[PDB]
């Protein structure tokens, strides 16, 4: 027999049932979105169309991203979108030559980064691309806030975004407790990224983390039926007294 829905749609159907459906609409959208990450390991085509040299005809051209493998270690650090490239190469760049397995790994470094919003120093593993990206963003706090989830490619980076975003949303006085004037200055510089605290809480959470967070919120002790029946009897008595 056949299934009612294609097997590839079963995942989306899960989000329409049970605890996943009750998750915030804004959070669910983040999961549904499939934005294309910035090209890192390949050179994108400049235009939609190109002139074929062999036959001199205008033909459509499409950008096909290279599959990038992200090891678990990368999630702790910030690799700026870089990852392992698992593919194959031709020996001596000759098609006739044997096909050889090849892996291209990035160059990782240990660096210290200071977050103005979080007022903390972090030791994280980064590539040269991450350092360049931070420079173009004029600071870590800008790089973390500006970069989308698909570009960051880091669980730690998305965790930092929730940290920074929540402080901006909550207007936390914990930042620079002794200097309120300094605290206001930092908050003013990042006012653009400030989003409501409600939405900021679900930023960067995984589906498992979101489900657990929603389970705790929903989790409540059952109400004794003694309290429920008492409210009903009292209401019935009051209405009976009113009619009398």
């Amino acid at each position: 027999p056949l299934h009612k829905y294609p097997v590839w749609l079963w995942k989306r159907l899960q989000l329409r049932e049970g605890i996943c459906s009750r998750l915030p609409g804004h959070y669910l959208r983040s999961l549904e979105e499939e934005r294309t990450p910035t090209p890192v390991h390949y050179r994108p085509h400049g235009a939609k169309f190109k002139i074929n040299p062999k036959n001199g005809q205008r033909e459509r051209v499409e950008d096909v991203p290279i599959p990038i493998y992200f090891p678990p270690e990368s999630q702790r650090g910030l690799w700026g979108g870089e990852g392992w490239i698992l593919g194959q190469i031709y020996a001596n760049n000759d098609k006739l030559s044997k096909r050889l397995k090849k892996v291209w790994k990035p160059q990782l470094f240990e660096r210290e980064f200071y977050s103005e919003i979080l007022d903390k120093k972090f030791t994280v593993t980064v590539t040269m691309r991450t350092l360049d990206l931070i420079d173009e963003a004029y600071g870590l706090d800008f790089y973390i806030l500006k970069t989308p989830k698909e570009d960051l490619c880091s669980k730690f980076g998305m965790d930092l975004k929730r940290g920074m975003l929540l402080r901006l949303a909550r207007q936390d006085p914990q930042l620079h407790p002794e200097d309120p004037e300094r605290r206001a200055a930092i908050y003013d510089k990042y006012k653009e990224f400030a989003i409501p605290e409600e939405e900021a809480e679900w930023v960067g959470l995984t589906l498992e983390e979101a489900i657990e967070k929603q389970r705790l919120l929903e989790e409540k002790d059952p109400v004794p039926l003694f309290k429920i029946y008492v409210a009903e009897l009292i209401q019935q008595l009051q209405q009976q007294a009113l009619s009398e």
Binding site: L225, F226, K227, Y229, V230, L233, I234, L237
Partner: protein, 124 residues
């Protein structure tokens, strides 16, 4: 060659296996040094048997009995028969107030009770 299908029991296996596995009897104590067994009186179930002298109910019921409709008890029915009368009287007298639910037998928590309904801590 070993029999997979048969039920695994303490009769099977070597001396170590046969000693460790039991037949489902509940433990009534612990083992001390020298494999001495200490029996805890409280762990031993105490049978609470009533006095049946002068008791009119017998194992069977006479066939000359009016058949009645089956009405399983519910939480609402118990409330209407055990808790509603007291609240109804107090409401007319105005003494009733929500803060005093315990007066009618409400238990805010089960902690500190000998027989706790949830989690059940007493045997049938």
């Amino acid at each position: 060659g070993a029999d997979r299908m048969s039920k695994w029991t303490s009769k099977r296996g070597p001396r170590s296996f046969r000693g460790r596995k039991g037949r489902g009897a509940k433990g009534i104590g612990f083992l001390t040094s020298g494999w001495r067994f200490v029996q805890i009186k409280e762990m031993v179930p105490e049978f609470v048997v009533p006095d049946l002298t002068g008791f009119k109910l017998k194992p069977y019921v006479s066939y000359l009995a009016p058949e009645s409709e089956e009405t399983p008890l519910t939480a609402a029915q118990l409330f209407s028969e055990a808790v509603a009368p007291a609240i109804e009287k107090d409401f007319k007298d105005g003494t009733f107030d929500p803060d005093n639910l315990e007066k009618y037998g409400f238990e805010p928590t089960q902690e500190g009770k000998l027989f706790q309904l949830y989690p059940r801590n007493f045997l049938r």
